[PDB]
Amino acid sequence: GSSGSSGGEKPYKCETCGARFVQVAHLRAHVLIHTGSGPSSG
Ligand SMILES: [Zn+2]
Numbered sequence: 001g002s003s004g005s006s007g008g009e010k011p012y013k014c015e016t017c018g019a020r021f022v023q024v025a026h027l028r029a030h031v032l033i034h035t036g037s038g039p040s041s042g
Contacts, residue, residue: 010020012027016034021027033042 007020010022012021012024013019014021014027014031016031019027019030021030032038
């Protein structure tokens with residue numbers, strides 16, 4: 001089920017793509033996808 005459709009209260013926003021999150025720990029952990037590289041997909 002859990003897919004997405006979530007965009008309400010979020011102070012932190014990813015400028016790299018334009019994402020958003022409630023806590024920095026989440027955003028700062030997502031921005032690593034672009035600047036960084038983990039798995040062989042994404
Ligand atoms: Zn992003």
